[PDB]
Design a binder for this molecule. Structure first.
Ligand SMILES: [Mn+2]
Ligand SMILES: [Mn+2]
Ligand SMILES: [Mn+2]
Ligand SMILES: [Mn+2]
Ligand SMILES: [Mn+2]
Ligand SMILES: [Mn+2]
Ligand SMILES: [Mn+2]
Ligand SMILES: [Mn+2]
Ligand SMILES: [Mn+2]
Ligand SMILES: [Mn+2]
Lengths: 338, 338, 338, 338, 338, 338
């Protein structure tokens, strides 16, 4: 039963990962929520990926930018930038990584295994359309690859003739034991973000970690806010002035209300496996309706996080004006949060 | 009777605000010219709005950016930026304001009433599709609103159940009396521009006030030039190398000739209240053909104003080249203004 | 007969200037390759132009940005910027010029005649739809032109009533004797790039000059790399992470291999007159299959050049990782170029 | 001052031919209203053309189908169908003609001169991009034209090198003196409709002539209704179930009210020479608000005319239903016109 | 856990009505599945609507065509065609109705209440964007309505100023005593289809009712197949050569396998509330995986039903060919069903 | 060197099959020309296919329609229609076949081998995106297929795990000994057209076979004209009033001149392997400039062939009109061909 205040035609704004197709491979599985599942999304698409301990996410690159939140476990990522500088790191649950457009990279689960959420900067992304190393070489002439590698063709007899995508491997050693020497050195700012290094803005019902370009300098395309709200609390009525919002609910149960313009309003129930979308500058709230902390990510195709809270808007507006607006006494306006 | 020099298929570039449907409300009226009326417009849309003394344009926001030229009267504007800092000011005829995308604001006419022109950073804008405070709260559950405001549900019984848009109010007190304290402070650069602060570039036939981001720093999306051309004068043949041009004619009568590419040319007569469009990098002139000084706004979806004049181009081009081009002697080409 | 490793549906990527329609004029000829010829090109379009000694390319402008490589001969360019500062220079084979959007300019061949390649910042550009001075003036009322020049209309009796486009003239004098005085002075950074000022990056089989905004400051829209590859040489396997690639072969014979995503691969034979396109972030190689040096241009709609080589990528990647990927031992992997 | 019952954003639906550019030629003039003037039109475009006595509209053809209503004067039209069959006729004020897609034809005014309205089956038509006989031959090699006509090239010496479009001529002789012999014979059904052959449907306030494919068999693409409404009369509330409606107001002053769905309503005043558009299945009324008979054409891109009257709908609806809907007693519902 | 025989990226093809937002009214409720929920749907949109006894679905029309399947209960429909002929009928569960584009109609539940499925001839339809009688009259001037009904304005004082959409009423009397006298008579063929008049085609695993234009003459836009499959049964491997398929599952549990081209295949699990889509000419099967009979609707935007069965295709094909294809002996090919 | 009469921007209208990628399979080869090679084509796409004697083109179907011309050799086709009726026939060079949308079919070369041209009813077609029998079953679960065929899964052990597309087989026996029995019988009209059954209309320089739905009833989507032009002859100036033209040149060298509207004209040379495009209603000619007869196919997405010749148009127009048009004498006009 929807609220008495819902009205008009608003698109579906919710899709569960459990309704997504499961590509299962030895060493892990993958599934995605794209604009082919949720057409209200115009900026971002999400992939939920899981790797068994030591399993590879095959070396690859793509036209889109990658933003990743570590759901569980631990993993190692490697990458190379456009100036020939290399990057290597290990991360645990709660951490992020970020590869801007066309930056090649790898992921390998460590002893714990891993599950992570990836966000891609085009709404029509697909994991089955990424540029894979083994696919690339499987479709390059062996004389050409031999000339490139400066070796003889016989050495390349056992190159795969078909991609691996996600495949099993052994847990690697320590970084200092595996890191390869590069005369260009490392990338000047990490492609990774370790989350204890940031402390969250605390509000009444919970906490918010804001990770944008001002916190994570390489993240020039996608930014996010990790929100944790205790039971009975609520993310207050607000909107984002610059961009559509793309949500992934990590844990808990929420009631989400969205008001587009023109008497348009809809309310949805979200839970821990769901992706949601808030249209651009649409006014919305997210209320905890479960007994455990509600954790989710607001993600945006925008290097800068920004939002606007209704309470703040009214607090800075002349009191007689808000009173004439809301048909409530100035005295009662004066007691709203500030 | 068009000039014999006109040729080819050129879109219509003229539309009168008097030919737009007028939304009249208790306390004011509004009418708009968009790509639903002038499809040659690809960047901007115009709104002509009128407020009775003390009347509010309801607290609201939109996805688009706002640029406003004050036609008549006086008014007060309030706003809040993305970092929580507030803004309040009074403006008179000739002044400007600017709200970048998603910045909420209110307008209240003062004792004189006011008429103003608003320009929006999308060609398909509509005043009837704005995000209104009362609409938002009318479509939010009352328990949710109460929890947000941290008050009891009964307090919100007299909340409007329907938008106000433009409604009557009493002329407010002085800012020094009505302003609210904000621990975040004021916005660092005003959302307002007082036009007496600006000196015009003066040429033979008139004056041009140029207001772009180097003059009006918050205006990062839309910039403009106010042009006044005396009787017998002309805006010389020129073009803008980076963007389409959108005109509003304040006063006077003009003959405007536009040359798109490929032997396409069309001539229009404009008068006060007309909206016009010059295609991107199209060559054009604007001649005063009336008894009175001609005043209009050239407005652009571009942070930097720029143009290129024909006479300057020829004066800097080698004389033999201009001579071979125009079949005119070097001596008289040397006679052109520089 | 295509290689066994090619697979799938890849668009055509090759189009010959010899297959483009030739507009012949008094004083020169022109032909173009656009997405009306090569729909896989989404960013840029190419124009091949030839001018007889002393011949004019008519004074003109366009919405698009111009990046030009001088194929043969010598020529003079003139231009004017938005701040009223002028530019004039002479250039030889191998030199470049660049006029950003809407910057008006002219070209005149010198004693040798000239042939040059122009690349434009929209894939649907057209040489037959540029903004011509005489086309403009032929479609402006003569009273208006008279007022603009403030001459009497008698002087304008011989204005062309029709474009000239490309017309004959005398080889002009030295810059020092023909240059016109401009109180605003010259442009602060040249619209020209003399290739003798830049040393090539040299690798084993050849050389490449990289010219982008860090080398050629006015070129904020288009960048390029001029590549020369000795017989038996090859441009090593790589991709461009940010942009589509647009190629013009100057001289020689090449075999070009392209790997799009999803096991998509195609091989092409390219020749002296040919235009090619490599899709965004597509992996590719370019092998010289002739006995004369292969010269070509990689051009991009991007102010910064960027690429990533497979050799460097594997070089910076952990050896066990590369070995697990490619089904070859660490020992032979340790033998790849770096 | 719009009715208080108007609401919401409705496109502009009115455009006056007097605001369209007038292409004037020796022997006549032309002007058009297309989606470049009235973007709410998605099906049809209008042309208002005037020919001096004996004047030709040049032999031509186009991709679109044209429907013509003769406003004043008399004319002769000729055409050819796809089976090699020819057609020739004379027509007067009030008469129609119809040329399906690609059917070539000519128009020549007779002694009175003529003005006529043409309607075209694409909203983006323009008269300046029609296929002209002289244009065609002016851009065909003269040897090719010579071989085609089986003649030698010097008779083609005075072939126009440029179109004629509208040029002067002598009022031709009688058809029985002028008709050329065609072994394929005449077309089986005339490309013309003489309006005196048609009985009007008579209603309370006026007359309706309905001409669709059941009446005018060749007009398989465009149909129409000529409506005349007496002073004080009204075109009753109705809608057209299958297509958009395109109007030309021949004479009088009208108030036209349009209701799209979702509480969207707009009201316009129309006068002679105005073109209007009613969106698909939109409900509308047309009231005469002048003292002279209101005459206009409702035109549709549809071979069959159809409409549905509100009064008829209510009369055929169960009385308790109409009452339950309108909160009016059965006693009153039984009194509506049926 | 998907089958291994699945591969590649196929859009989501399943959406549950229970995940669609519910519009609740006094007397009924509504919910829809469109391409805002199911973007793979390119032809049709679905509405699940339920009415309380005596409740009206308001008199209305829409630009799209309506095809309706009666899920439960009984109801009365009324309509009017383009020739002024009337229609009224009652239907029970399992029956259909059909209103082509713009045909006005009403629905009123009888004593039992009703639930029905509506399918509309555009994928972006919306129940909240329908043309309602009262919405229309609420936005028509009262003087205009007074003239239209030929009554004085005092009678129209109680006209709704706002839509009703779905509202309560009394179960009406028999058609014979409530039917209104229309001098134009009844429509020539009913807008209704009583399913007991049609015998199903029987196959061993179930039954198929095929309803297209040859059986239901007014239904010229949408046709359907009602399929019932016993436990252990299967709708054999087949495709439809001319159209997309739009599915609504009435009862049961199904496993549906879809094979698009190019090794793309996906399998879904369907049940009672679900909507599905089969892309055009895609090969598919539907297996009953429950204990109860599986009942569903295959619906098409196509007046004629068509399919092609794999078994028949192979049976009519030369056995040497089928054997050469499938690597099966001829004798085994000879025992496939035919 | 293009004619003096060419002018303006025309798309490229030519592409050679020799420039298309050739997919080689044991037993044959295939290559295609689509809008990824020739973006001016908006209706049709071409495939050039060659099958070794006895080789199969795998059993398949597609969304688009097939119209095919037999270039050389002989072949056998099989198909099944939507009413369960089967078709089988063998054909030789010069014959056609036609399978409407979604009609499944097979091709097998006979003793001679075969090469044929296929034309498809969408411009973005690709042979590598066809629905293949083995692809379908290889991506269908084998339990499902076994239940479908009512066999044991053991039987399905050797089903391919991958498409066959083009594979070798033995040249089959006579139709009467291989045709399978079908209780529904054969299709009422053949999907094949034997060209010896058609007499060509003979004109002066050559012959024309016109094959459309009035000649070839199953061909309701694509029609064609086979044109043979003797040396020194020419296909006269003409245009097609209803559709774009798609050409394939069987034999010879041609000069083709195309006139779009608005002074747009371009001329191309076509030869033995070329595909061409003529825009809709564009006026054009095709002249033989070789020493052998020029044979080509004009193909159209239109069930009815139609064209309009300039000579017929002028012969049927009043002579004074043609004379005033062309500035030619009435007597010289009267000697034009008729
Ligand atoms: Mn990745
Ligand atoms: Mn938010
Ligand atoms: Mn300007
Ligand atoms: Mn240029
Ligand atoms: Mn490259
Ligand atoms: Mn015409
Ligand atoms: Mn009407
Ligand atoms: Mn309905
Ligand atoms: Mn089916
Ligand atoms: Mn032709």
């Amino acid at each position: 039963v929807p609220p008495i205040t819902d009205h008009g035609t608003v698109s579906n704004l919710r899709f569960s990962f459990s309704d997504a197709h499961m590509r299962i491979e030895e060493g892990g599985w993958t599934r995605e929520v794209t604009n082919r599942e949720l057409p209200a999304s115009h900026d971002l698409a999400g992939v939920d990926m899981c790797l068994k301990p030591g399993a590879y996410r095959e070396l690859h690159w793509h036209k889109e930018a990658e933003w990743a939140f570590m759901i569980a476990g631990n993993a190692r990522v490697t990458a190379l930038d456009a100036e020939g500088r290399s990057f290597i790191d290990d991360i645990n649950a709660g951490d992020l990584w970020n590869f801007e457009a066309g930056i090649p990279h790898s992921i390998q689960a460590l002893d714990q295994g891993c599950e992570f959420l990836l966000v891609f900067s085009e709404p029509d992304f697909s994991e089955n359309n990424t540029f894979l190393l083994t696919d690339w070489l499987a479709h390059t002439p062996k004389d050409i690859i031999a000339a490139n590698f400066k070796v003889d063709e016989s050495v390349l007899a056992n190159l795969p003739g078909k991609e691996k995508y996600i495949f099993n491997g052994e847990v690697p050693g320590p970084i200092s034991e595996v890191k390869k020497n590069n005369p260009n050195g490392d990338v000047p700012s990490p492609f990774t973000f370790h989350m204890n290094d940031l402390k969250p803005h605390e509000f009444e019902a919970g906490k918010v970690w804001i990770i944008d370009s001002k916190v994570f300098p390489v993240a020039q395309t996608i930014s996010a806010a990790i929100v944790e709200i205790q039971p009975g609390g609520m993310r207050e009525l607000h909107w984002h002035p610059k961009s559509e919002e793309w949500d992934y609910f990590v844990q808990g149960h929420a009631k989400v209300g969205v008001f587009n313009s023109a008497s348009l309003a809809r309310t949805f129930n979200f839970q821990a496996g769901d992706v949601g979308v808030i249209p651009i500058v649409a006014g919305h709230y997210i209320q905890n309706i479960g007994d455990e902390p509600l954790i989710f990510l607001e993600v945006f195709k925008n290097p800068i996080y920004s939002d606007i809270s209704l309470n703040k808007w009214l607090a800075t507006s002349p009191t007689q004006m808000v009173s004439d607006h809301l048909n409530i006494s100035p005295e009662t306006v004066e007691q709203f949060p500030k």
